[PDB]
Design a protein around this ligand. Structure first.
Ligand SMILES: Cc1cc2nc3c(=O)[nH]c(=O)nc-3n(C[C@H](O)[C@H](O)[C@H](O)COP(=O)(O)OP(=O)(O)OC[C@H]3O[C@@H](n4cnc5c(N)ncnc54)[C@H](O)[C@@H]3O)c2cc1C
Ligand SMILES: [Mg+2]
Length: 309
């Protein structure tokens, strides 16, 4: 059954915390654990980082943490590095169910010369490698939390939530789904439909797959889960199987859910959105609908939630 979480006073706040810590005086947090989430055929490493904030930097599901990597700002010499934002991949209780830790899902940004493949440490992404290189006991400068675009609408505990992720965009949805299904939160008993779509490069690039697959067995009447593996599957038209091609497999069901008030969420690299928009336009057209009109209605009704980067 559901996992006991503490302390339940984390449910009492009426508003999400924002900018509790700021870049000029960050909170010095401590790494608990760092682990790769992916197998050897993945094109890059994505790691799972557990951070002990001691209860000093609480957050709501869907928010972001800021991390200030070490070193001087290369463009304001003598200045600290700029904040990098990461979608929190944990619930407000965290992976230890105690309200003291939060987790990040971090893709290593690694530079390869386009012609030769050669590497260059001055060109790798600073914060992402800093995080995935971290070890238990390392200190991390933490800011935030910040963001409200991806807060979970909880007014209707029987709402429908359609979650569209690529890569590390799965992060907010890991938090949503633990709150909906895994944790014992007496004031939020989810009885709607949660539907996760995840696009990644191949089977070895899947993120948290065992957790999501378990929800199919635990909550078969409230959870659905579909994956698109681009390098390893192909779409109806011969293209690489992308998350939008999976949406298209369920186009009638999805459009009916949207018309019924479902929330729909998008998270991941911003390059995911043009193909999704193209697919939704073609789906609408086949149904004899205007996607522009439909998207405007969804935004007007506060059903459309996008955090891409
Ligand atoms: C709201 C929000 C949420 C986010 N959520 C996440 C998340 O959950 N997970 C996640 O992994 N990321 C996330 N991001 C992205 C994250 O904030 C960083 O932008 C990303 O991790 C890269 O930061 P970095 O410090 O590693 O790279 P930077 O040091 O900022 O470098 C940026 C890029 O430039 C490249 N580069 C550097 N120098 C050169 C050069 N000379 N020539 C060519 N290329 C070069 C690097 O390789 C890198 O790809 C999020 C961003 C936003 C805005
Ligand atoms: Mg795997």
């Amino acid at each position: 059954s559901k996992v006991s979480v503490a302390p339940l006073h984390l449910e009492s706040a009426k508003e999400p915390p924002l900018n509790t810590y700021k870049p000029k005086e960050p909170f010095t947090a401590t790494i608990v654990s760092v682990e790769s989430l992916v197998g050897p055929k993945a094109p890059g490493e994505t790691c799972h980082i557990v951070i002990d904030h001691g209860g000093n930097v609480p957050y709501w599901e869907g928010q972001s943490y800021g991390v200030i990597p070490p070193g001087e700002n290369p463009k304001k010499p003598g200045a600290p590095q700029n904040v990098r934002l990461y979608s929190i991949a944990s619930t407000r209780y965290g992976d230890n169910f105690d309200g003291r830790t939060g987790s990040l899902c971090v893709r290593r940004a690694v530079y390869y010369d386009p012609e030769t493949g050669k590497e260059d440490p001055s060109k790798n992404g600073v914060c992402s490698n800093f995080l995935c290189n971290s070890k238990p006991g390392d200190k991390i400068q933490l800011t935030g939390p910040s963001g409200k675009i991806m807060l979970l609408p909880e007014e209707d505990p029987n709402a429908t939530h359609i979650m569209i992720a690529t890569g590390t965009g799965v992060a907010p949805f890991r938090g949503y789904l633990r709150r909906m299904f895994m944790e014992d939160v007496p004031n939020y008993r989810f009885g709607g439909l949660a539907w996760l779509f995840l696009g990644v490069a191949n089977s070895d690039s899947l993120l948290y797959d065992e957790e999501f697959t378990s929800y199919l067995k635990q909550y078969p009447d409230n959870f659905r889960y579909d994956k698109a593996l681009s390098r390893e599957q192909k779409n109806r038209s011969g293209g690489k199987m992308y998350v939008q091609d999976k949406i298209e497999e369920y186009s009638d069901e999805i459009f009916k859910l949207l018309d019924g008030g479902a929330h729909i969420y998008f998270c991941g690299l911003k390059g995911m959105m043009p193909g999704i928009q193209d697919t939704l336009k073609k789906v609408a057209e086949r149904r004899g609908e205007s996607w522009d009109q439909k998207l405007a209605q969804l935004k007007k009704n506060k059903q459309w939630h996008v955090e891409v980067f």
